[PDB]
Amino acid sequence: ARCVRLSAERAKLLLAEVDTLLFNCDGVLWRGETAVPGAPETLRALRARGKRLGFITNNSSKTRTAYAEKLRRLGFGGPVGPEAGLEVFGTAYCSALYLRQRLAGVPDPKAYVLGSPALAAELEAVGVTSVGVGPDVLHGDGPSDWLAVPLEPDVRAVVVGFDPHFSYMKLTKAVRYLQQPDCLLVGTNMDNRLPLENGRFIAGTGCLVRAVEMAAQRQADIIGKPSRFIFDCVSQEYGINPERTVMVGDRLDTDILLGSTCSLKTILTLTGVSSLEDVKSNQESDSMFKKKMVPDFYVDSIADLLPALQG
Amino acid sequence: ARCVRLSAERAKLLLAEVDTLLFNCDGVLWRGETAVPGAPETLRALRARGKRLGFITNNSSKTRTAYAEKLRRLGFGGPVGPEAGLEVFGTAYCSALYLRQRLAGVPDPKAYVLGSPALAAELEAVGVTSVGVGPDVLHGDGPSDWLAVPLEPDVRAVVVGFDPHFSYMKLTKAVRYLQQPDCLLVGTNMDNRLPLENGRFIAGTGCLVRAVEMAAQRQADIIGKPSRFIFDCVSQEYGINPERTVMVGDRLDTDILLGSTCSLKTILTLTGVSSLEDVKSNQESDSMFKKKMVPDFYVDSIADLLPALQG
Ligand SMILES: O=C(Nc1ccccc1C(=O)O)c1ccc(Oc2ccc(C(=O)Nc3ccccc3C(=O)O)cc2)cc1
Ligand SMILES: O=C(Nc1ccccc1C(=O)O)c1ccc(Oc2ccc(C(=O)Nc3ccccc3C(=O)O)cc2)cc1
Ligand SMILES: O=C(Nc1ccccc1C(=O)O)c1ccc(Oc2ccc(C(=O)Nc3ccccc3C(=O)O)cc2)cc1
Ligand SMILES: O=C(Nc1ccccc1C(=O)O)c1ccc(Oc2ccc(C(=O)Nc3ccccc3C(=O)O)cc2)cc1
Ligand SMILES: [K+]
């Protein structure tokens, strides 16, 4: 955990020692719809050497198939056909898995999803009916009118994911549903800001999840990184061996901390949000938790692996 | 800080040593439009005894003048006419004063207010123009469209107050405005829940302010209780003497903590949010901050002061 630059020799040693590599799609492989220069060639070379490539993302907007299509379109060489989805693990699919297990044996389970269409679709495939996907503008002169709005009959969970239609009405409805102790609170991810191309960014799902949490005085179960649950899903379907697996990430609090908590080796790409200066601040601090989110190796871009892989 | 019940004897002695009593309007004096039973008579008796009564509230929805009208309407016996407003101190008015200080020397001052009409009105009286009050529904299929929406040219502050129209578009616009370093971030209050009559509650301004804070990675300046600023505003016009002043409140984290930090004596009314068990948790805990939010006296309702006052 010394944030060593992964030079070609160091990279060759690490690559020989690891037969699986896990990546964060946003900020490592690609930004916006534009690939990080050289990243596609790097991942294709890694597949050529026989290394298993897996993808972990905190984005609830896209399904497994959609993310796989993006990776193939941009030349990261995923398997073609339906099998592609198996390679990518995202908060939407993992949220569906969490609700499948937790609400197992519940008849015709339904949930209030303050989230994207893909999240609702993944839940539907799991069998969880979804309500609340879409706009919910506020109507009423005062609080009583807002609290009077009708609610769906059987809602056993609230899923907070990226919802551009998020409103105070949705927050009030979420609180009302969550007043029942049985009702679960699920947060897709806890990212404060999410990066976009050209150094632009938009507010992160975490802002919504913290708003709902505070309003209901409940602590949500966060499916996404850095929670061990997303790693457990990957481990259930990939059979990950922590000693022989690497996590490539751009965000210290989510990706790198996932690696540290789950005993995976960590590579930090500076293409994305986090910076070497942030690592230095965490290193200097005496807090052990801050020390956890310190990467084993750092690369300017994933493309810096190409010299070793082009061997 | 032993949370002793305010018996009639204790009340008479305490009233003898204190010549000013400050109250929280919501949850102590009244809930909704329904007054706490006997409270109007208590405050009227305090006026008759000569005790100076002042009001501090975290609600940005209501103007100073409107709160005064509520006080006379419900029989709490404030001075009639314009001077009524002098008695009430609220987050809207205090926020306007804060912006008067910070935006002093600014031509045509403007702010993006995620808030009520009353908040904008108080700002307007101070001279600060308001933008964004009202619905701003999100339209557009993706992030680029949302960030392309035009913004007003001159915004030197963003004020996050209770906004029933809060939406992701308003959060994005607030983030964009706060990206300029000069732009200030002001939060009217930081309450997670606000109480309503009938034991129901809705989400608080604090949830919205925390969402904006996280999205902008900025620390908002919180005007409302327990911030020292609201007490300074009260003291500017009242000349508060801590030895002779009491704070009557229903919420430990806001009212009682203001009393402790500003060295005012504290009475807890159980009519509102906080409960004796919460006080017990703070007393038992070894955290010093929890010990700060422990009331000196506790009264079931302010009406239990009437026996001492009817003397
Ligand atoms: O919810 C969306 N749509 C709809 C909802 C209801 C009805 C119709 C639609 C309709 O698109 O017709 C939606 C969701 C997302 C949208 O863009 C985004 C694309 C990508 C991301 C993203 O990088 N996400 C993250 C990445 C890293 C870490 C966290 C996140 C996160 O999202 O928390 C975000 C938004 C557009 C429409
Ligand atoms: O989130 C809160 N609770 C919970 C969340 C999950 C589960 C349980 C609870 C549970 O309280 O059982 C929360 C707690 C307390 C809250 O009041 C507050 C009151 C005042 C302030 C405040 O002025 N703070 C600041 C002061 C000055 C400058 C900046 C700030 C700032 O906060 O930035 C904060 C919270 C609210 C929610
Ligand atoms: O009690 C209230 N507050 C608080 C009390 C204690 C602690 C915290 C808060 C706290 O708000 O954080 C309260 C009272 C009344 C409330 O109804 C409201 C209803 C409507 C609006 C509002 O913007 N309305 C409009 C805005 C734009 C355009 C039109 C309108 C309209 O009403 O036509 C605000 C508050 C909420 C909380
Ligand atoms: O608040 C954040 N920022 C700032 C705000 C103001 C000023 C400066 C900063 C500034 O980062 O300089 C913030 C930082 C990092 C954030 O990622 C996080 C991701 C996840 C969690 C988290 O609890 N993850 C959970 C996982 C499992 C179980 C429970 C939780 C839970 O959240 O309950 C915290 C931070 C977010 C905001
Ligand atoms: K960077």
Numbering used by the authors:
A (entry chain B), B (entry chain A): 11 to 321
Relevant lines from the article:
Phosphoglycolate phosphatase (PGP, also called glycerol 3-phosphate phosphatase or AUM11) is an evolutionarily conserved metabolite damage control enzyme that can dephosphorylate and thereby repair three adventitious glycolytic metabolites: 2-phospho-L-lactate, 4-phosphoerythronate, and 2-phosphoglycolate. PGP belongs to the haloacid dehalogenase (HAD)-type superfamily of phosphatases, a large, widespread and evolutionarily ancient class of hydrolases with emerging roles in human physiology and disease. All HAD phosphatases consist of a catalytic core domain with a Rossmanoid-fold. This core is accessorized with so-called cap domains, which are mobile elements that can shield the entry to the catalytic cleft.
CP1-bound PGP crystallized in the tetragonal space group P41 with one dimer per asymmetric unit. CP1 binds adjacent to, but not directly into, the PGP active site with one of the benzoic acid moieties (referred to in the following as proximal) at a distance of just below 6 Å from the catalytic Asp34 (Asn34). The proximal benzoic acid moiety of CP1 forms the only direct hydrogen bonds via its carboxylic acid to the nitrogen atom of the carboxamide function of Asn199 and to the side chain hydroxyl group of Thr215. Overall, CP1 is embedded in a cavity that extends from the active site of monomer A towards the dimerization interface with monomer B. One side of this cavity is formed by the more polar residues 35–37, 68–71, 125–127 and 143–145, which originate entirely from monomer A. In contrast, the opposite side is formed by both monomers and is generally more hydrophobic in character. Domain movements were recognized for both subunits of the inhibitor-bound structure only with respect to chains D and E of the apo-structure, thus indicating that both monomers of the CP1-bound structure and the majority of apo-PGP monomers adopt the same conformational state. Despite being in the same conformational state, there are differences between the closed state in the apo and inhibitor bound structures, e.g. the substrate binding loop, rather than moving solely towards the active site, is also translated outwards. This additional movement is needed to create the space required for incorporating CP1. Hence, CP1 appears to inhibit PGP activity by locking it in a cap-closed conformation. Based on the inhibitor-bound structure and the competitive component of PGP inhibition by CP1 (increased KM), it seems likely that CP1 sterically hinders substrate access to the active site. In addition, the cap-closed conformation of CP1-bound PGP will block solvent entry into the enzymatic pocket, and thus prevent the hydrolysis of the phospho-aspartate intermediate during the final catalytic step.
